[PDB]
Design a protein around this nucleic acid. Structure first.
Lengths: 66, 65, 68, 65, 65, 64
RNA sequence: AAAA
């Protein structure tokens, strides 16, 4: 079992870096990666919203993550 | 393992109003009645079946315990 | 993890013959009568019998309540 | 028991014109020459291969038996 | 059976130029150099990998037999 | 029969060639393919962005 | 790249 998806994400979760999730419709949902599974990433901010990964273009971190 | 069954099942028991933004930027604000592997059945004036393959984000209207 | 609300909902909109609206991810309204559905398409019947693709449907909204 | 292969296998068996609308709001009008699982070869002035994942609804030009 | 790989393998052996329309409505006009099950490598000025999950209709520039 | 998605990216990385990444939104993400997993390409420019393959339309390398 |  290997990948770059969980690693990159569980990182911006642990070191809690502010992230910007871009949607395939051109919407910028910016928050913090509380958790994620195989279909959704719960981006938390004022309210915790469940984001389906099938609408995510790119997730750009606000600061590099070790 | 799953974070969707808990999130949705939790917006059902608690009867917390939701918004369900669509991949077209369409806001569907109702209440989660139930859901399966491919849809959720939001309830408002008339219950609707929203395909998850057309759902961008589902922001609750209030945090939830 | 073991239930299919998709076959009910649409089947109940046929046995009761309740008019559905159909919404497309492009923002299109396809209003008609659920004649039959498989695992990928639902055949809406209005002036002609058209095979709509489920992969292009955002929401389907009955025009009045429905029974069970 | 699918209605996608029969419906198409009958809009080709009685050689009926169809519209093969696209999810981009595009209408591809022609005649169904063949299909498989991911494509239907609509042969109009040109023989093009339309990916079913880009098709919203396929509406016949007239009723088909 | 398949109606996809063949059409493409014949749009390669004959070396017909092709237009590949994207779900966005973009026209990538080049020549089909190769394909797997998820991408089709179209080479015009520089070989570009085009994902088939973003292709609507692939119309040839001339009949392919 | 044989994968062409990895060998293409594994060769656009080993040769450190700039690459264009058109998206299904008509977006153009220019950068360098640092790594690639089944669902994602880790294109980098100023910060390492994770682009989802299911949001990419075409990927035109800058040079052969 | 319309926190819509």
């Amino acid at each position: 079992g290997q990948s770059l998806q969980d690693p990159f994400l569980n990182a911006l979760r642990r070191e809690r870096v502010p992230a910007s999730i871009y949607l395939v419709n051109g919407i910028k949902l910016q928050g913090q990666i509380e958790s994620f599974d195989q279909f959704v990433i719960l981006l938390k901010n004022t309210v915790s919203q469940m984001v389906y990964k099938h609408a995510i273009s790119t997730v750009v971190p606000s600061r590099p993550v070790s």
